Amino acid sequence: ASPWRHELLSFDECVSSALKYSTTPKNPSFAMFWDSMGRAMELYYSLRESPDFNAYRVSRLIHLLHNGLRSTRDQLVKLSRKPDYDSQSFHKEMMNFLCNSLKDISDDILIGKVSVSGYGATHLLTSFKELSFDDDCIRIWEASKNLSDETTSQAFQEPKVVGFMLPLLYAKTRSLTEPNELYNQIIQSKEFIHPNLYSGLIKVFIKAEDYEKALSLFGQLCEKAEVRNYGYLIETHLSFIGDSKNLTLAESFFDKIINDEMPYKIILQVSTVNSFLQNIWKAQNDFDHVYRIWEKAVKFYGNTVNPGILSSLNNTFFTIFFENYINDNINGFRKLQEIITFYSGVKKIDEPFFNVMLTRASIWHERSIIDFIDKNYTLYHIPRTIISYRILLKSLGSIDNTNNEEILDRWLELVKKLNELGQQYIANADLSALRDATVVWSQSKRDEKVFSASEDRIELYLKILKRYTPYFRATKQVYRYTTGCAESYPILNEYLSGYSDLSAEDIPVPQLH
RNA sequence: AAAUAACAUUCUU
Ligand SMILES: [Cl-]
């Protein structure tokens, strides 16, 4: 027959080319991969009317969109900094495109236009899980039971699809009935048991803290696992680290990665490490235990991982640090120096390391720690981004020992660094830092006097807003940081009746905008 | 059968 022959042929070449790229270890291949996705998705809306659009072709497309989500997340962490929320970014639009593309395919399956296999069903539901749509995963799965096409309905009931579903079902129902029945069948079964069924059942038992059943299934999973498809052992192993409430079992599995004890490769996934650090802090309140695990993670990473990974780790660590030393900047400052010395001994210091430290140090409300971090950027020869200059301006809102001159200086140096790094206009995060250093500080000191029972920063704030308005990303930022900001900080309302007639006296000196 | 993917520091509007 072949009415849609050319579109079917190009779809197979497209999907296979991009799937091979995303499974093998800007650039022409990078551009090909992302253009192959839009083209394949474009062909999908035409080929869904064809009868030769089998479950295999749909499943290969769903897998490809899944790898697109994986690649988009990877690209976000490889950047020198996260893009501003209010500006255009490849990460945001590509994520929405993949997500919307996955919605259209899920709806076409729930209606019956296209068929899907158990392999395609798992990538569809895993994708929606990675998009934080757990409840939608349960609806799609249970709606597959009452489908006309019994073949696709049977695919959603295959063991590997059930394996993905078990952790979501235990989160909702908290029922161990169906899991324990499956445990009795699987432990003594001589038949083929899909590794993803092992994985989901292990994860349930880890959350349920029935660790003996979790470790027993884990041993069977290991002896049966195939070298080419060993990733099931990675998910379960990491689950023991980040999900086990028994910290002694979690740390043993953590050491198995540090000491390279396992027969399979495994990444020290920072999300898993962060959850492990948080569980130690919530359960033990032992900062030394948190500090010892953080030290092992930093030495494990070294220079092998992206700076965005260590940034996420240091975020968790310094958040715990400044909660522990919330009322002790004296012993805290000595401990920070030990942390800086250790971190220097592992690798060259990255900027997010000091950015997180400076951000969280606002609880101390002292100027010495601000000048200490600012000095260390130059001392350790840190590649600078605009994040530091934003935080250095924001930090002035947590101390009283400063003047409108220093607020201007740290604002001017931020605008300079914006144009030095080729930034187009002034983003929301830039104005939010100036607002936090003026309006929030003034509202804070005002609320203290009411609760208790270079003289004005709000005037400088409104002067810079009006002076630098033509450099804004959008003129709607004027309403956002004036009338809209007054709804949250009412002390701005008493300065705003005469904003239209206000004059400005500042010192811009731009370059590239 | 077709595994595995770190959601980072600065951003209420
Ligand atoms: Cl930057």
Q: Which nucleotide is nearest to A304 (CA to C1')?
A: B6
Q: Which nucleotide is nearest to A129 (CA to C1')?
A: B7
Which chain B positions have some atom within 7 A of a protein CB? 1-13
- Quote the CA–CA distance of A401 and A45 in Å, as a whole number: 63
CA of A331 to C1' of B3 (A): 48
CA of A177 to C1' of B9 (A): 44
Burial of A463 (0-12, 13-18, 19+ CB in 10 A): middle
Point out the residue nearest to B7 (C-alpha to C1'). A73
Phi-psi label, residue A305: left if phi above 0, alpha if psi -120 to 50, beta otherwise: beta
Q: Which nucleotide is nearest to A310 (CA to C1')?
A: B8
- Quote the CA–CA distance of A306 and A469 in Å, as a whole number: 36
Max CA-CA distance within chain A?
Answer: 87
- Quote the CA–CA distance of A474 and A206 in Å, as a whole number: 49
Cβ-contact A217, A207 below 8 angstroms: no
Going by C-alpha positions, the residue among A53, A55, A34 that lies closest to residue A45 is: A53
CA of A117 to C1' of B1 (A): 13
- Quote the CA–CA distance of A423 and A409 in Å, as a whole number: 19
* Angle at alpha carbon of residue A271, lines to A268 and A277, rounded to 5°: 90
- Quote the CA–CA distance of A361 and A349 in Å, as a whole number: 18
CA of A230 to C1' of B6 (A): 18
**What is the Å distance from ligand 1's center to A186 Cα?**
53
Going by C-alpha positions, the residue among A369, A274, A367, A360 that lies closest to residue A324 is: A360
**What is the Å distance from ligand 1's center to A316 Cα?**
22
Helix (H) or strand (E) holding A390: helix A386-395
DSSP labels, A295-350: HHHHHHHTTSS-HHHHHHHHHHHHHHHHHHTTT-HHHHHHHHHHHHHHHHHHSPPP
Domain-wise residue ranges, chain A: 1-157, 176-259, 267-383, 385-513
Q: Cα-flanking dihedrals φ and ψ of residue A60, to 5°?
A: -65, -35
**What is the Å distance from ligand 1's center to A432 Cα?**
16
Q: What are the structure tokens assigned to A46, written together?
A: 């035409």
CA of A494 to C1' of B8 (A): 38
**Residue owning tokens 């099931």:** A232
- The SS3 assignment for A426 reads strand
**What is the Å distance from ligand 1's center to A385 Cα?**
4
Contacts of A406 (CB under 8 A, 6+ apart): A396
Cα dihedral A106, A109, A111, A115, rounded to 10, equals 170
Q: Which nucleotide is nearest to A307 (CA to C1')?
A: B8
CA of A303 to C1' of B10 (A): 24
**What is the Å distance from ligand 1's center to A79 Cα?**
10
**What is the Å distance from ligand 1's center to A398 Cα?**
24
Q: Cα-flanking dihedrals φ and ψ of residue A472, to 5°?
A: -75, 155
**What is the Å distance from ligand 1's center to A203 Cα?**
40
Phi-psi label, residue A332: left if phi above 0, alpha if psi -120 to 50, beta otherwise: alpha
**Residue owning tokens 């000095």:** A375
**What is the Å distance from ligand 1's center to A330 Cα?**
32
C-alpha to C-alpha distances, A194 to A59, A163, A171, A205, A217, nearest whole angstrom: 18, 8, 22, 17, 12
Cβ-contact A477, A494 below 8 angstroms: no
CA of A69 to C1' of B7 (A): 11
CA of A6 to C1' of B12 (A): 52
Point out the residue nearest to B11 (C-alpha to C1'). A429
First to last CA, chain A: 58
Long-range contacts of A466-470 (CB under 8 A, 24+ apart): A466/A499, A466/A502, A466/A504, A467/A504, A467/A505, A467/A506, A467/A508, A468/A415, A468/A426, A468/A506, A468/A508
CA of A430 to C1' of B11 (A): 8
Going by C-alpha positions, the residue among A248, A270, A224 that lies closest to residue A77 is: A270
Q: Which nucleotide is nearest to A432 (CA to C1')?
A: B11
Q: Which nucleotide is nearest to A23 (CA to C1')?
A: B4
Q: How was this structure determined?
A: X-ray
- Quote the CA–CA distance of A382 and A379 in Å, as a whole number: 8
Helix A159-173 and helix A195-207: axis angle, to 10°? 10
**What is the Å distance from ligand 1's center to A80 Cα?**
7
Burial of A191 (0-12, 13-18, 19+ CB in 10 A): exposed
Q: Which nucleotide is nearest to A308 (CA to C1')?
A: B8
- Quote the CA–CA distance of A210 and A176 in Å, as a whole number: 10
**Residue owning tokens 């072949």:** A2
Resolution in A: 2.5
Number of H-type helices and E-type strands within chain A? 26, 0
- Quote the CA–CA distance of A352 and A391 in Å, as a whole number: 11
**Residue A227 CA neighbour count, 13 Å, CB half:** 1
- Quote the CA–CA distance of A20 and A305 in Å, as a whole number: 23
**What is the Å distance from ligand 1's center to A168 Cα?**
39
Q: Which nucleotide is nearest to A301 (CA to C1')?
A: B6
Cβ-contact A49, A3 below 8 angstroms: no
CA of A316 to C1' of B6 (A): 13
- Quote the CA–CA distance of A332 and A350 in Å, as a whole number: 21
**What is the Å distance from ligand 1's center to A73 Cα?**
19
Instruction: For residue A377, count other CB atoms closer than 10 A to its CB.
Output: 19
Task: Spell out where chain A is interrupted, by the residue before each break (C to N > 2.5 A).
Answer: 25, 453
How many Å separate Cα A300 from the centre of its chain?
A: 21
Instruction: For residue A369, count other CB atoms closer than 10 A to its CB.
Output: 21
- CA gyration radius for chain A? 27
Q: Which nucleotide is nearest to A267 (CA to C1')?
A: B6
